[PDB]
Amino acid sequence: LKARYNDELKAKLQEELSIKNVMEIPRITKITLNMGVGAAATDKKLLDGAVADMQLIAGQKPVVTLARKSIAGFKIRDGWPIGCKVTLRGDQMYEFLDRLISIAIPRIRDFRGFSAKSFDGRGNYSMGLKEQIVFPEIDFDKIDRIRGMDITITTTARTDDEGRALMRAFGFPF
Amino acid sequence: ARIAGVNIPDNKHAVISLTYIFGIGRHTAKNILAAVGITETTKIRELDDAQLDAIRAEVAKVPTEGDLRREISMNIKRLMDLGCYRGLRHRRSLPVRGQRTKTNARTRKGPRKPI
RNA sequence: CGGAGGAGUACGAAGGUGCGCUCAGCGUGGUCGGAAAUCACGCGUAGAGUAUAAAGGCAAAAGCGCGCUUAACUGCGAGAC
RNA sequence: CUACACACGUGCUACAAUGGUCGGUACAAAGGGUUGCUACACAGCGAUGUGAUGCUAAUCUCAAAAAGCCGAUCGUAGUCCGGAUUGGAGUCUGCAACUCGACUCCAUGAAGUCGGAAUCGCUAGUAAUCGCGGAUCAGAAUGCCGCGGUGAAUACGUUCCCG
RNA sequence: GGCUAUGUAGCUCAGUUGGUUAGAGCACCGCACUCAUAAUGCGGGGGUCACAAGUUCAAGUCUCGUCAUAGCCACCA
């Protein structure tokens, strides 16, 4: 995207929302990718698989997320690693959004999977995409089991309607 | 290849490979290949991208995988909701087409349960 | 021979220094994943932590990280409790 | 009379390569048929429908024997093995197939990889395996009573088990 | 009145090492053998720790208390 949002979506959104000032025009700040894996300390093979998948879906090196606190109910202790995460900003996040809306959504079997609302009341949107497939990666042979993933889009929009306007302008189904 | 959302075997002949999709049997695969023009005994690895696209377009005209599963679930749930005799049998998880239940109903009612 | 609890250790880093960082709780949203795991944003907020009992303390944090290291030195020591 | 947390007896189909599927192509006996069996043609993927022909039968019909032989393919996999269960659409008998019929087509594709202690049948055209017919009967056989095709292995002996 | 010790399948028992529950043998239930029993052979399923509180790898595996139980000390004038 980039140039498209810079050239028309800004004035178009200002028209849409009757925004008085250029800064009050909403923008999207960051995109965060998360995998939460349990029982990672058991083998660590699945953890390496998670970091590999992240590195392919997003062209950045992920960082492993350590457990905070120690839960008796689960098998975790505060020492062990239990996840992976990446943050995408600027050009990287724009290319990630472009590739997402281009390839992933047609490939997933359920359509319009993102609901209408899925909002926190802060203009920030979250989606949970099942399986590490449905993204440009290695073919199904020579990969581990499928792993779900969390995408979170954090924007400068103040309200849910402003967030929805920004997504519809970008082409997001909802 | 990946057709209709699943990865079919590559070394098997086309007719055998296509029956790996939920919703296609031997007759349906036999008809799809005849409609497209591909020979029956051709292996999947020996098809080109255009022929794979043709097969993927032909598969679209029949219900498959998720849609067919959803429809079957809808029918059974409608029967149970209505509450007729067939829906009652479905609720009880017993034979639905009039087979005896004094003996020989293990497929429907699962493994034996001690008293 | 009144009322209640602890000790007979641990640590070459859990010591030194330079630079850097703040806890805990609750509420929304988000795959497996829930009362409670990891991710994002808010609201009140030291109620967290300090190898270990309690008390007196702790924002220049005395709490938490990273790089380099041996001052866990030798000879002393005005003056005090 | 068909119920269904369970237990037992008698059977059928399998668990595959001495096999499965497709194409071509041989060889029986016995029995039934006028409220019945139907050549042939057309329609249908099919069960079947319509028209029509012969037969009261060594005359016409059920009727395709199947395993077999030749060629291709599958290459040991829960599979091109297996065919339970379930969703959808139909045909026929019958006044009427909900409880509660048989059969056809599409889809689905369960258990099962040779079975513990124990136990059964069989001495030759026998066992094993393959098909065909009938009585009952509007319709409804894996049961019963019959018919043929292919066609084995082993018996030293009476010590023990049963009579 | 004082100390010690113990409390877990239907019964007998091990429990262990605070992650961890737990395992056994009888017994029981199905099958088999038998004219019918017993004896015998085959298969299978079973306890979540006497409780009440606290700390934490809830912990039956530590510390406190209540109850049940067993033992012997309750003396000199």
Which residue intervals of B59-109 are DSSP H helices? Answer: 65-82, 85-92, 106-109
Tell me the C-alpha distance between B77 and A28, whole Å: 43
Tell me the C-alpha distance between A109 and B65, whole Å: 9
Q: How was this structure determined?
A: cryo-EM
Nucleotides of C under 7 A from a protein CB: 24-25, 27-42
Rounded to the nearest 10°, the torsion over CA B53, B59, B64, B65 is -20
| Distance from chain centroid for Cα A171 | 16
Residue B92 CA: distances (Å) to CA of A173, B71, B80, B87, B97: 42, 21, 10, 9, 13
| Dmax (CA) of chain B | 62
Domain housing A94: 1-174
Report the nucleotide nearest the CA of residue A78, measured to C1': C37
Amino acid identity of residue A91, one-letter, is D
Please choose, from the candidates B57, B36, B35, B45, the residue with its C-alpha nearest in 3D space to the C-alpha of residue B10: B45
Tell me the C-alpha distance between A131 and B5, whole Å: 13
Tell me the C-alpha distance between A89 and A29, whole Å: 7
Residue B21 CA: distances (Å) to CA of A146, B34, B53, B68: 20, 18, 16, 11
Tell me the C-alpha distance between B61 and A83, whole Å: 42
**Residue A54 is encoded by which pair of tokens?**
């992240």
CB atoms within 10 A of CB B63: 14
Q: Are B45 and B64 in contact (CB under 8 A)?
A: no
- What is residue A152's three-state secondary structure? strand
Tell me the C-alpha distance between A151 and A31, whole Å: 7
Please choose, from the candidates A93, A92, A105, the residue with its C-alpha nearest in 3D space to the C-alpha of residue A152: A93
Q: How many CB pairs under 8 A join A and B?
A: 6
- In chain B, where the domains are located: 1-70, 71-115
Q: How far is B27 from chain A (nearest CA, A)?
A: 25
The number of distinct structural domains making up chain A is: 1
Rounded to the nearest 10°, the torsion over CA B18, B20, B23, B26 is 50
Phi first, then psi, for residue A116 (nearest 5°) are: -70, -45
Q: How far is A140 from chain B (nearest CA, A)?
A: 8
Å from A47 (CA) to D55 (C1')? 85
Please choose, from the candidates A30, A82, B101, A98, the residue with its C-alpha nearest in 3D space to the C-alpha of residue B109: B101
**Residue A154 is encoded by which pair of tokens?**
């954090």
Contacts of A7 (CB under 8 A, 6+ apart): none
Print the SS3 string covering A54-123: HHHHCCCCCEEEECCCCCCCCCCCCCCEEEEEEEEECHHHHHHHHHHHHHHHHHCCCCCCCCCCCECCCC
Vertex A100 angle, CA A95 and A102, to 5°: 95
Tell me the C-alpha distance between A143 and A121, whole Å: 38
DSSP-derived secondary structure letter, A134 = S
| Dmax (CA) of chain A | 56
Tell me the C-alpha distance between B34 and B101, whole Å: 45
Residue of B nearest to A133 (CA): B5
